[PDB]
Design a protein around this ligand. Sequence first.
Ligand code: B12
Ligand code: B12
Ligand SMILES: CN1c2c(nc(N)[nH]c2=O)NC[C@@H]1CNc1ccc(C(=O)N[C@@H](CCC(=O)O)C(=O)O)cc1
Ligand SMILES: CN1c2c(nc(N)[nH]c2=O)NC[C@@H]1CNc1ccc(C(=O)N[C@@H](CCC(=O)O)C(=O)O)cc1
Ligand code: SF4
Ligand code: SF4
Ligand SMILES: [Ca+2]
Ligand SMILES: [Ca+2]
Lengths: 262, 262, 441, 441, 323
Amino acid sequence: MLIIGERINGMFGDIKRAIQERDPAPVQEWARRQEEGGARALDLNVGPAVQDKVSAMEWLVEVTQEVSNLTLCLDSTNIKAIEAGLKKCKNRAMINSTNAEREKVEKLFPLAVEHGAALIGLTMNKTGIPKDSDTRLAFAMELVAAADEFGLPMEDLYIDPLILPANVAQDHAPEVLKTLQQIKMLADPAPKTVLGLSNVSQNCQNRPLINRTFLAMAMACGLDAAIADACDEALIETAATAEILLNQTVYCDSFVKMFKTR
Amino acid sequence: MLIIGERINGMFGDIKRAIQERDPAPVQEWARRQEEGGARALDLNVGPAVQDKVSAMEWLVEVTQEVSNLTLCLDSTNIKAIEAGLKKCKNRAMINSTNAEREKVEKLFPLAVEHGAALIGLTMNKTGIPKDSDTRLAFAMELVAAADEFGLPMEDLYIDPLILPANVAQDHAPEVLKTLQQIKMLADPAPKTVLGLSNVSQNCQNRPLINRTFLAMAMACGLDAAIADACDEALIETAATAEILLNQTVYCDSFVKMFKTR
Amino acid sequence: PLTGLEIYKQLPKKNCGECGTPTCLAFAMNLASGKASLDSCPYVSDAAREALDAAAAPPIAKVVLGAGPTAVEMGDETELFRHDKRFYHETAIAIQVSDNLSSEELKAKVEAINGLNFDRVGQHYTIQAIAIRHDADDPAAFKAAVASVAAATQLNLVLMADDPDVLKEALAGVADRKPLLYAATGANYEAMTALAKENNCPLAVYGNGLEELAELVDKIVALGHKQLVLDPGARETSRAIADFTQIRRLAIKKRFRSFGYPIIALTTAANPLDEVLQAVNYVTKYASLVVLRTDAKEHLLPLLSWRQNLYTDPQVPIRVEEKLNEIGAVNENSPVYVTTNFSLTYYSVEGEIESTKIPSYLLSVDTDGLSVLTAYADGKFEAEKIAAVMKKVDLDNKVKRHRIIIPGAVAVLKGKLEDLTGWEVIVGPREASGIVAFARA
Amino acid sequence: PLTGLEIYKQLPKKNCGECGTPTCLAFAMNLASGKASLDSCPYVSDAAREALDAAAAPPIAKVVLGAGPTAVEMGDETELFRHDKRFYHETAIAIQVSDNLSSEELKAKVEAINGLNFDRVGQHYTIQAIAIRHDADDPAAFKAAVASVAAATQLNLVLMADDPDVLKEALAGVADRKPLLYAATGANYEAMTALAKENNCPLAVYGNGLEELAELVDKIVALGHKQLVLDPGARETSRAIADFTQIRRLAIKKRFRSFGYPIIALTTAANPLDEVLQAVNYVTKYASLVVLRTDAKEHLLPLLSWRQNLYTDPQVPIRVEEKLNEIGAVNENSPVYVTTNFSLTYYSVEGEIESTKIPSYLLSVDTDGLSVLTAYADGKFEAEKIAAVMKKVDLDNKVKRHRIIIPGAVAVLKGKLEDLTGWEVIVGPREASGIVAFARA
Amino acid sequence: MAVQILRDRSRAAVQKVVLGATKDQGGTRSHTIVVGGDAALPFHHFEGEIVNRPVIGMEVQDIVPDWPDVLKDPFTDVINEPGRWAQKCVAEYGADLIYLKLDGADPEGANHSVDQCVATVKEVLQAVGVPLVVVGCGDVEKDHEVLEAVAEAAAGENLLLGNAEQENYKSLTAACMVHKHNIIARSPLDINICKQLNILINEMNLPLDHIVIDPSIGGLGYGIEYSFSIMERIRLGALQGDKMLSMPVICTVGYEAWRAKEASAPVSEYPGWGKETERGILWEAVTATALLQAGAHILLMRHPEAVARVKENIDQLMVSNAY
Ligand code: B12
Ligand code: B12
Ligand SMILES: CN1c2c(nc(N)[nH]c2=O)NC[C@@H]1CNc1ccc(C(=O)N[C@@H](CCC(=O)O)C(=O)O)cc1
Ligand SMILES: CN1c2c(nc(N)[nH]c2=O)NC[C@@H]1CNc1ccc(C(=O)N[C@@H](CCC(=O)O)C(=O)O)cc1
Ligand code: SF4
Ligand code: SF4
Ligand SMILES: [Ca+2]
Ligand SMILES: [Ca+2]
């Protein structure tokens, strides 16, 4: 399981105040505490506030890789900011994200191969987020076909069925699992998958109980990556345990400690 | 999810003494403490401790339904003891366990239709527990084919992939999940399933973390029932949260409390 | 795909291993998985062809009523409940007209049937076909009846008679538009299928109960005509609801190939008001075609409204047409309110505005139908697209003032909008129920 | 069981929708889900046949070596590691003998080959075939050799002659049996393919390297013969491990149909000791048939021992017989030990008791293969199953004293078993390595 | 068409453990033998680099062993003299390491003094110039006194102290750290206990490249496949990034092969098996050959001719089969 830190996001207070005045201290501190939690990836988002997405993204990268060697994850809908950030990356990074829109595919898939990075693909288009797994799976195959079309390693493709809150979109959660499980019939080797785990507990009671529960249920369906709370110790335990139950890592009595210090 | 109380078993110290001395008090107590936990079924096993089964099995049925109206589950290999238990059952019954052998099928399958109970089938033979999922499915298919043979409702058939410890049989857990995932695709309407959830944490550090995590992963694969410790609050919360994420029960802010007091 | 159990009982019982698999029960597992083709086993009955179709084909086949732009499609549904997914093809409404009426009374009635086109809340409701029945005492009166109707309307048609020899004389000229042939009975199904084969028209299958219906269907299937609609013969609404449920359940859930076809219902209520309410039950109870006996414009709008609503998509939020919605009487003076075109958001706003009896204008910009808050965090409702719809709605010419009212949920967009708009942005209440306490003050 | 990509990258990419699906990529999804049949799209030809033959078929083909109870099965494997699942068919052992040898030397060697069956640990090791290679200058010496061998031995045969004419002349009298034809080469594969075609026998494919093997196989397959065994011509054990792995990998992981057949390995080590060690590497590296030269029992025993161990299902544990087993002389007044039939438990006691020295009896009760703690918890090891086995050998008459020794682990069984049995009970150490410390006491 | 060679890229590699020191390193050995460094499956050169070939150590005891009559024959001239025993295994039989198995420390047996066990170790250090692998007899209390005293006096030689299990790792690990020595981790045919043990040993701040795994291999025909599968699983994990299974695998074929009847049983007793000479030579050779395909780095053998044949096998498997 790949834990991607989602604390460094412009929607958060301290992060947004940091980018405005270019304060590296709050950003770097969360880059450590998430890594200490067991996260092997750091998702960077500038937020909707800052008008200049391009330069703000480059700043988040240059100060994060300064105190961490983890695989950075660029999070912006603006392609101009993504490519701008990739040029500043000192190591392997991730592009988040792209949809089945051809206008986006033709200008992001080559970009992924160009920098040799990872590309996260969304199962959607200009319309929005579907429900039926048969629909999401259709968008996913285009992303798989796009990888082979532009010469991108299939193991570098992360398909995201886009999970919605479990209260107002309860019928989405089982459809996401039904999507993940059937992704294994797309390619050989099959592409990896990723989810924004925190979204499933959006405005629900006892968020951690819903987050870690859905994480386990997703890994059983073949979840290869997840963007969730890296500071949640109760979540890291579930991620480690579920990985053991999938026989992805040899069992030991310190299996939880081995996940954090992996 | 149907949680069956496992505490009433002849392997424990209190229950074993409660059989030899014929003391209803421990049996009656654990029949309540598990019901409060959220269990809607009780697994009744005399254990290998007691010499005679028929005398002990019948004694359990009477003292259990004295202070509880929950669904009674009989657990034994002795056919005479099992059939003797169904005699004193006023409420709904459930039998466990049966294998794929015809020498066990035609001696247990018609017994289920007779009293109109639920039959828990195993995916194994005299040699031992299978490894892959293709073998479990082949044995599960025999259970479904025999279910339509003796005239038994498909929703009353519970398939048991037989989960094993995650330390010695770590390579069995991902096969059990693959089994469950392909059980709902071998028949329509699909037969229900059941696991010995507590066995996956046999001789492992932090057993509850192993138990509840595997439950969610199994429910994602289509687990309709499970036999585990109903006195574990952390386990009950996972069983409730998983139903919400599977859209089996309408979400509410008190979703945890509602499954506990269903 | 198909359930492994159902292919096993479809399979014989030889256990001969000619397939390459030890037993038939193990070969059933390979089929459901996909480890082998079913063509290897020779020891199979006609169920082989059944396994070929019952698995691949959808539970309810699609049959088209008519040809061209005036052709409507029935059947093709896969849901017992609209909240799960949705209902694809709407119910085909048909008005019945007898032939024993004079030519002047026949044309005058069909004339009103074509006038059953309704426009409401931005959308348009239309009926599909016209039912012609044979109540005369002579066969020749039916040929002149259909010709009068067919040369009057361009909508779909559906003829109703028992004798095939009477029907074919009236089908000669109207055969091109493929009118529905109602109905096939257990006495003349042989002559009906033959006539429906030459003209390639959908054939309406009738049966007294769910038993005779299932039998007579298979009779026509064996003849080579698979374009069928089902009529359980239920007259009362209680009988129909149960029967229509069975035709819909067995086809979808049990793969019943005898009931895997759309349903045609008949309103038998004498009173016109009772007829509509009985028709509402049908269009809700999985019906695909209903024949009414009311041509009044008052008894069609409520029915047609419910039809459009029931056959919408839930996962997809409902969209109010983008535009400006005046409330009550609008003075150039009256206040402007901007919001989101979500049905929920503008519906609430509409309730708030009209309920407080305050004349104004609602600018409901196209957010994709998303709520003001949803638009707000997915960059669909931003001071730039909003000032954009301000000049696009053409509201500036309908007021003397230059002030617009935004939701108290996104007040933060007022300044940047006040600059872009050229108008004065005021930040109202976060809930529309306190808008009446904002107007007076 | 087929990837949507694999299916897609084999379609015309026209997006005509003649299949009833908007695009090919969407139809590829429908094939992987089984929503439609591949026979629908009239386009393409070899693509459809190759896919169906590659989809619903094992990675390694199954070629049986002859007929009758003597015949063994080769190939048919789906794993790279034994722990992932299991290794099915054991390696075929074949002893090579020259044809230029005299009759008395031939018969003497063949006679020794027939006695290469071993008996150890309650198991039975047997070889498979005998290799007859053509070394002589006269083609008549080859037919006189094979006919001579076929009279003495009843085992399988495998002929090694380049010239097809020399082979057929010798194959004529033994055609009805097994004889594997070694080997078809890129210069004489035409005549060799026809020989195995009429006689219906397996054919060996040779190729100097990895690439030459691929080209030759595809040609032989296109002639109507599939039953083949591959020989990459690897004469070095290091060069062999690499090549042998590829055939097993490419056929399973990449579905390479040219390498979807078992492998025949040839030992080249001069020293008979180095030959067996080189054979251990082969039987471990996916080689299905190996051709040895040394026929000594001193060499075949450790080789056939490792062959048996490697091809045992990890899930079923190894089990010894449920019988009293005697260690040392046993005077009829020696101690009595009770233990489980599990092969790793038994020889934990046999090696430890026999190590101390002196006679003793050792009763292996039938747990079905489960260990003392194991069968303890599964209840297959109670005071009841033990006392009943005490009397299943009538043990008391054999030993003057009534005393038995129980595992320190399951020692608690002490009381209850000492009563039902009527035999006194002494509970030993937890670990069997204390069998030396109990005898002293 | 054509053929593409499938090459499985390894995400990680097995640890590189250094055995022995030199005059410059503070030791007295002639050379330093390194094991591990493999970046692929056992002897798969086409998809990884096999820098260091597996080595063979010969068992030398401080006292005369209780081995069968056949096995004792090639040592009869030096079997009762450890200093001359180890010196023969190197020069004559060509051994890579000297496996000093102290059975004389057993209180029930020879009951050698603590200063005598350290005298035997210091004797071999003067006899040969190859690295040593010194393990105890099996007694918990004795080995804690022996191995500690040995590590203290042989400090600087960089030896390989052995027999450290799950319930007993605290006493031995503490000695290895201070005196800069390596350590062997023994596991009762359990990869879980094996991995867990390596964690416990490392948590005391002992480097990962100073640890070697002893899976307690089963004898040929007596459950060798149970150890064969485990050794593979450890090998896969070490390549998949599992650093707790990245330790080289040492095997004790000498003890496990010569404890079977099939190895030393006379031909007259079991006619179907054949001569006992060729059998015993091949029994220890085959049981070690199979483990080489499982990823055995250090083999602990006894029989001279058995070594000479496995040595030949290794020399052949190290021939690069790269495409
Ligand atoms: C349904 C819904 C969804 C649906 C959207 C369907 C739709 N058509 O809206 C879906 C499932 C897609 C969803 C998703 C999201 N949602 Co949402 N959603 C809701 C929800 C549950 C109710 C929507 C609704 O019908 N509201 C009813 C309408 C009528 O309200 P309204 O548009 O605000 O209008 C009212 C008032 O503002 C006022 N009013 C309106 N116009 C005007 C004008 C004037 C002048 C005045 C005076 C008053 C006025 O009157 C109306 C009622 O009287 C609310 C929770 C709630 N019930 O309040 C959350 C909520 C709006 N969602 C929210 C969020 C966060 C999201 C996401 C961004 C989640 C994420 N992590 O990305 C996504 C958006 C993008 C995406 N699609 O991923 C948040 C917004 C706050 C926040 N940023 O945290 C809310 C409030 C949930 C919460 N946090 O409690 N959502
Ligand atoms: C591998 C294993 C399994 C395997 C079985 C492997 C096999 N071939 O037997 C599997 C996974 C199938 C399994 C199943 C079971 N297992 Co289990 N299993 C283990 C395990 C890991 C090792 C067994 C083993 O091979 N021991 C090695 C053998 C050689 O030891 P042994 O049989 O005890 O023999 C030694 C001594 O007893 C003595 N000895 C033996 N005989 C004699 C005779 C004499 C005269 C003398 C002097 C000495 C002597 O010497 C022997 C060697 O020195 C143990 C834990 C452990 N590491 O000990 C648990 C264990 C044995 N299992 C146990 C249990 C509980 C079970 C299950 C009931 C699990 C469940 N919840 O259903 C199931 C049984 C039912 C079922 N099958 O559904 C328990 C037993 C205790 C208990 N019941 O509370 C243990 C101890 C786990 C634990 N809780 O620590 N198990
Ligand atoms: C949409 N998520 C997402 C993604 N990327 C992908 N591919 N998929 C996703 O669903 N990247 C962004 C986000 C994941 N990261 C996050 C970040 C924060 C919160 C969150 O819950 N934040 C708090 C705000 C707290 C504060 O403002 O102080 C919240 O309550 O919403 C959730 C997910
Ligand atoms: C074998 N399990 C099982 C089943 N039924 C089926 N179909 N499958 C199963 O695997 N019914 C019985 C049991 C499930 N119930 C249980 C009961 C106890 C423990 C358990 O963990 N017991 C303690 C022992 C405590 C004591 O000895 O006092 C343990 O540590 O093992 C686990 C599961
Ligand atoms: S060929 Fe047909 S009848 Fe024969 S065993 Fe196979 S499935 Fe059964
Ligand atoms: S008919 Fe064939 S070529 Fe045309 S779209 Fe369908 S699959 Fe593609
Ligand atoms: Ca996966
Ligand atoms: Ca199910």
